[PDB]
Design a protein around this ligand. Structure first.
Ligand SMILES: N#Cc1ccccc1C[C@@H](N)C(=O)N[C@H](Cc1ccc(Cl)cc1Cl)C(=O)N[C@H](CC(=O)NCCCc1cccnc1)Cc1ccc(F)cc1
Ligand SMILES: N#Cc1ccccc1C[C@@H](N)C(=O)N[C@H](Cc1ccc(Cl)cc1Cl)C(=O)N[C@H](CC(=O)NCCCc1cccnc1)Cc1ccc(F)cc1
Ligand SMILES: [Cl-]
Ligand SMILES: [Cl-]
Ligand SMILES: [Cl-]
Ligand SMILES: [Cl-]
Ligand code: NA
Ligand code: NA
Lengths: 302, 302
């Protein structure tokens, strides 16, 4: 029993974290086989950051300009390139701790584990969702850029996020591991605003099913609703529209609990319209949207 | 910026997790050097569980009765003993992945990271506090017994919890790594009730300081209170008494934010008496008590 924000075990990613230094700029890199991946803005000075031309800055770099440290052993760089917003440094040593891995670009509403690192050294692990506005609400300090987000499936690490910057609002933006930003953001030190955010409806419903599986039932009701009438209430409360695909994804949880998806939507509708009136769900006094249906199935009983 | 429930990187503990089997009973064990540690009730059958005499059951065991698997390699047991409620199995191979480590018995209100494991294989990591009633509100399914809780300080793993059982209320009980239960519990399959729980006051205050550090200030006020008058309100809301030692521990956070501890207590008093009135603190609509002052300092900016 019980339900917790749960990260993947981080060991396989810990063995890949390194430190990349260019002059006075140091951030984290990811060492897989003989390649180190890190944010390309490591080649920027504090002056270059307002509006860099990265093609210019990179062509002016030498391999010996890059200081790569794994633990306390320096890795010699033998080649460098740029793929979108990530720098790729070829090193002369393949990482002996390289896990089985994939790079994947995720959709908003999907979750991943973040290994927050400083100077190539892991400090903590936590669970994040990609917000509908392509930011993440992370916990990051100066020096954390280059930390990665990931999922694990049967000892294969699927890397999906590399951290690039904190916005003026204190939320966080970055790329997939091929250097493409999530959202409209760019890697320059200017004030960038994210789009207006929305609540991840399919995830809230997943989490209501988690609660039922764990014995919370006080919010259920005898009513049901149609998809259309539910979405009318969803739009009013800044919730993402619920699609038929979302309904089908919630199939397994619906079947395990015996509660039709549209039955659960009537509960959510009532919770949005009336609040909780002091009660809690899975220890929360608000509706939680950073658990996917997959997260719930993974953590909850069969 | 940002504030998340944050676990320690779990890699060093992942390399120690094994599987221990006695007949039809399998749980998780911890392999450090040439010793495997696991709950002693692995030597119980489903019948023995109502009221075992463990001295009896253990003296009837042979080394070859214990099946210990690390990954897919079987470890041969060469000796066994019992220390309180933990079984100790000497194996012929020292764990090459053994980290620097300590065993520590923690106080209620302290937090630790849990590596939830099934059949010797890690599945997830999350943060827990030891409740004042010596339970933890974990996330555990059948097969998780033997999973450990831990803190990490400069590459030393301080193991503090081994999981032994879920109570009828769905909360969780276990021991330190020398086999002493936290709280009054015993390892037999009977319905055991925990004492009435209380909220960890010093931790709530730490978390209010985290919020200030992160820019949440709406709950502050110009008032202050004495320790005695605060504790009068604390008792009324089932909060632990705040001690002078708690005040002194909150010193660093108080100094960083410029907010006297007893100033912050006046905010907590007002929050207890009036609620939040729909507002949130660090994304929470209730007062959070599973972050210690140390957790806040570790995660927040200087
Ligand atoms: N994580 C992280 C992090 C956090 C703090 C310091 C450092 C780092 C890592 C570090 N690497 C990095 O992100 N630095 C970028 C600057 C930057 C570097 C490189 C690139 Cl490519 C792009 C950018 Cl924008 C950075 O300083 N952002 C600040 C961070 C900041 O002051 N928050 C205060 C929010 C306060 C707040 C809280 C709650 C509600 N409301 C407001 C915001 C900002 C300001 C002016 C800009 F014009 C652009 C961005
Ligand atoms: N984690 C975990 C876990 C969870 C589920 C299954 C298995 C395990 C691991 C496993 N190893 C283990 O804990 N099994 C013990 C039995 C046991 C084994 C060994 C020892 Cl030494 C002591 C005990 Cl008590 C176990 O089944 N407990 C159940 C678990 C249970 O039904 N919860 C339902 C709660 C429902 C609920 C939810 C919310 C609010 N209200 C109620 C509760 C219980 C029942 C009768 C007893 F008489 C004693 C304990
Ligand atoms: Cl060169
Ligand atoms: Cl680009
Ligand atoms: Cl023997
Ligand atoms: Cl005992
Ligand atoms: Na977590
Ligand atoms: Na966590």
């Amino acid at each position: 029993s019980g339900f917790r924000k749960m990260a993947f075990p981080s060991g396989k990613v810990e063995g890949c974290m390194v430190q990349v230094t260019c002059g006075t700029t140091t951030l984290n890199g990811l060492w897989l086989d003989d390649v180190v991946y890190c944010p390309r803005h490591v080649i920027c000075t504090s002056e270059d950051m307002l509006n860099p031309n990265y093609e210019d800055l990179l062509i002016r770099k030498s391999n010996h300009n890059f200081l790569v440290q794994a633990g306390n052993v320096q890795l010699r760089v033998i080649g460098h390139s740029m793929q979108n917003c990530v720098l790729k440094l070829k090193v002369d040593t393949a990482n002996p701790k390289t896990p089985k891995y994939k790079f994947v670009r995720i959709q908003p509403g999907q979750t991943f584990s973040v290994l927050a690192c400083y100077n190539g050294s892991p400090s903590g692990v936590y669970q994040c969702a990609m917000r509908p506005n392509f930011t993440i609400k992370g916990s990051f300090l100066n020096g954390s850029c280059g930390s990665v987000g990931f999922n694990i499936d049967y000892d294969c690490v699927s890397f999906c996020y590399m951290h690039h910057m904190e916005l003026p609002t204190g939320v966080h933006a970055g790329t997939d591991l091929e250097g493409n930003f999530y959202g409209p953001f760019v890697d320059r030190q200017t004030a960038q605003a994210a789009g207006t955010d929305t609540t991840i409806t399919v995830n809230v419903l997943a989490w209501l099913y988690a609660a039922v599986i764990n014995g919370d039932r006080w919010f259920l009701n005898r009513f049901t609703t149609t998809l259309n009438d539910f979405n009318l209430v969803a739009m009013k409360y800044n919730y993402e529209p619920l699609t038929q695909d979302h309904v089908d994804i919630l199939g397994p949880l619906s079947a395990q609990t015996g509660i039709a998806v549209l039955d659960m939507c009537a509960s959510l509708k009532e919770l949005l319209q009336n609040g909780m009136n002091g009660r809690t769900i899975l220890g929360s006094a608000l509706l939680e949207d950073e658990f996917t249906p997959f997260d719930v199935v993974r953590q909850c009983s069969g």
